[PDB]
Amino acid sequence: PIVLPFVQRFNNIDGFMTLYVAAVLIHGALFAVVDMTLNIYQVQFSLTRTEWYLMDFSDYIASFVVAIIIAHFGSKGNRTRWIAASCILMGLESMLFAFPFFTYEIIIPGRQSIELCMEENEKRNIICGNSVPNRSKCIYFHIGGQCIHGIAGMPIYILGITFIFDHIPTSSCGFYLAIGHSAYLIGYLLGMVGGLQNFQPPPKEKTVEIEPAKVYQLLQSGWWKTFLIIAAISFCVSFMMVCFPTSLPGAHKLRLAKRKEQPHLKGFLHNIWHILKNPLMLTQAICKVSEYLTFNTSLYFLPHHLQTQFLITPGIASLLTGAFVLPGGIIGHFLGGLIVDRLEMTNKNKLKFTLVTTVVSVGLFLLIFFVECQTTTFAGINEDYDGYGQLGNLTADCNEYCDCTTSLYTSICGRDEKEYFSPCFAGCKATKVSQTEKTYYNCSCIKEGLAASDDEGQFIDAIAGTCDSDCLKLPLFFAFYFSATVFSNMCSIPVISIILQSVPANFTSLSLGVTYAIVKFVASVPAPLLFRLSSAIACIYWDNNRCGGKERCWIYNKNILVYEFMGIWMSSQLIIVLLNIYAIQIHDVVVHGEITE
Ligand SMILES: *[C@@H]1O[C@H](CO)[C@@H](O[C@@H]2O[C@H](CO)[C@@H](O)[C@H](O)[C@H]2NC(C)=O)[C@H](O)[C@H]1NC(C)=O
Fold this sequence. Notes:
It is built from 20 helices and seven strands. By secondary structure, it is mainly α.
């Protein structure tokens, strides 16, 4: 008996939009946390870099095994029911990805595995790896957590937008296409922003080794807190969508406005065959490939590049891309989408709109490449340590006494402006830590250095972290990075907007699945390997003495990576130019075939 005006105003075509972005927002909020959550799980919990990608890969293929199946199933049944169910399986997944943190907080603290580590012995506390059991058990919680993510997450991004296609007019779908994309972006922001404020250490970064044993508690409990709230929201949003009508009263009024004036295998193939037989969609999908190839690569390569040429803390460097690529992205859909929506752009109009959009963007990427040419301050990698030892001498006497470990080595600055790695390897037999900085004392393995130096309560000492005197180029880099990002997000709307037009209304449901199948398999499966091979190409100088099978590098080649990664994007960006010049002529030929004035 719910005949209140609400459920009549809650069956509005925006009443579906209100819950979809509400469904998307927590969906956006979820994944961004997980990538770091997976990443920190690898480093913290005694994993290899081999298994982490496998956990990452689990989300990707899970969407791929449902990007087609649910699309065939979304065509035949109620879209509203399936989305909330896929919203429901978000709730099951998100808490499930938080059970191992609470159940297995005993995996690897510094001293909480009492059976084998003695509280007085230091070598005992870092060996007897009982952490690798109760680790692979969690990975089963985690590979499940990643798989339930993609199997259920993908129908949310297919069916909901399909409901936007088939129920909302064209001249405002891009207005709705943009917000849905951005609601995934805004969760990419806060998935890092909200999550990391708890993962990033408390006001006490700088106490005795209890802090690694206290930071350990706040990350598992940090996500176990976060996912408990996240998952339940995915339930209450699903419960509201289930109450939404099967027969949408909003579309029925519009359907009669647009009415006037089996998914068999062969019929499935009839949809499959025309797509290849229409070289318009052929270009649309591959243009998206270079779009995602250059995008995803940058959002990964950039914090690594800011860590190697601009010498920015890897935790801080990751933030720099995360907190700054979105402001370009959000308006890129917002301004990009509203251009077609306000102007009711035609198929010929958007193709011209896409070309000049990308062409200037590449010259912006090219402009960034020109900026890389400028010289920057160089720390370490000065070939054999001033004649006192070779690369790898690094394991001298002062390494052994303060127990330096070749995996977490960081560069520290001496007063000679020379950059020394492994602040404890600097021979610093004493360290007094203040409230706002970390400093090292009695730094023996330092060279004369120490021209004027300074301090107050103590005299002379070296300051932890890298010292940078010429990082101004940084504002040029982001500035050029922003406008390239904006152009990218206003390339997405033109390609996705066209796909709706050249497909009949009943077949638009299977349209999203066709392109979405290429998203995770053809692109995201071969991509990491293409990066990984060329990642070592600039990371040649691996720590061969300790890490073993390429676990930690020391020379991410600041000249080769710049030429390789951005050149690949230069190779990648231009493919869109060739694809679209192929499309526009073919589009104009085929449109001519239907016009033949
Ligand atoms: C290491 O630094 C400390 C202070 O940061 C220096 O302190 C001296 O330590 C010796 C121990 O042999 C004491 O006899 C002195 O009285 C300490 N000095 C003061 C002012 O308290 C210590 O000298 C440094 N190590 C070396 C090898 O010089």
